[PDB]
Amino acid sequence: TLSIIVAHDKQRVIGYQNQLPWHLPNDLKHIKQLTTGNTLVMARKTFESIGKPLPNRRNVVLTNQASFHHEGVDVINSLDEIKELSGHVFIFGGQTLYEAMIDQVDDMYITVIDGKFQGDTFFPPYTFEDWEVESSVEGQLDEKNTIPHTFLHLVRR
């Protein structure tokens, strides 16, 4: 299975200055629940924003830099190599990768953030006729989670 996983606001902003605009712990928890034991493919600026591979899953970074190397990261250099990865693979961002892959993935796990944060990167448009909703549920809000958010799981039609 090849899956997108992303969080975006109502404007479909995902990022600003190579960081996430918002801090939403419940999104990070959701990330962890879905991806533990599986494989992440992240494009290079995303990897550099996060700064280190995430524990307890395989971290693959996509880059055209031949000398790119990092401890605990496998490196690929074209989108064709994504097909070759085994098991459940998550396209983990950023925009360049989401743009490239949205017409290729089997399904998408989207966290829709009920907010408007200014951004310099976006998640591509996606429509009702391409995607069917497998589930939609609202995240629980609390002292640490103050922005309303929906977890949406879409599967290609």
Ligand X SMILES: NC(=O)C1=CN([C@@H]2O[C@H](COP(=O)(O)OP(=O)(O)OC[C@H]3O[C@@H](n4cnc5c(N)ncnc54)[C@H](OP(=O)(O)O)[C@@H]3O)[C@@H](O)[C@H]2O)C=CC1
| Binding site members for NADP(+) | 6-7, 14-19, 43-46, 62-65, 92-97
> Which residue in the set 7, 91, 105, 112 belongs to the binding site for ligand X (CB under 6 A)?
7
DSSP 89-154: EEE---HHHHHHHTTT-SEEEEEEESS----SEEPPP--TTTEEEEEEEEPP--SS--S-EEEEEE
Which DSSP state fits 16? B
> Which residue in the set 93, 102, 112, 154 belongs to the binding site for ligand X (CB under 6 A)?
93
Half-sphere exposure of 101 (CA within 13 A, CB side): 30
- For residue 32, the minimal CB distance to ligand X (Å) is 14
Query: Is residue 27 part of the contact set for ligand TOP (CB under 6 A)?
Result: yes
Cα(109)–Cα(61) distance, integer angstroms: 20
Query: Is residue 31 part of the contact set for ligand TOP (CB under 6 A)?
Result: yes
Q: Which is nearer to ligand TOP, 14 or 75 (CB)?
A: 14
Choose the contact partner of 67 out of ligand TOP, ligand X, none; CB within 5 to 8 A by kind.
Answer: none
Q: Residue 93, class by beta-carbon neighbours within 10 Å (0-12 exposed, 13-18 middle, 19+ buried)?
A: buried
Choose the contact partner of 14 out of ligand TOP, ligand X, none; CB within 5 to 8 A by kind.
Answer: ligand X
60, two tokens:
């693959």
> Which residue in the set 21, 53, 93, 119 belongs to the binding site for ligand TOP (CB under 6 A)?
93
Which residues are documented as binding site for substrate?
A: 5-7, 27, 57, 111
> Which residue in the set 4, 14, 60, 154 belongs to the binding site for ligand X (CB under 6 A)?
14
The three state secondary structure string of 64-94 is CCCCCCCCCCEEECCCHHHHCCCCCEEECCC
Q: Which residues bind ligand X (CB under 6 A)?
A: 6-8, 14-15, 18-20, 43-46, 49, 62-65, 77-79, 93-97, 121
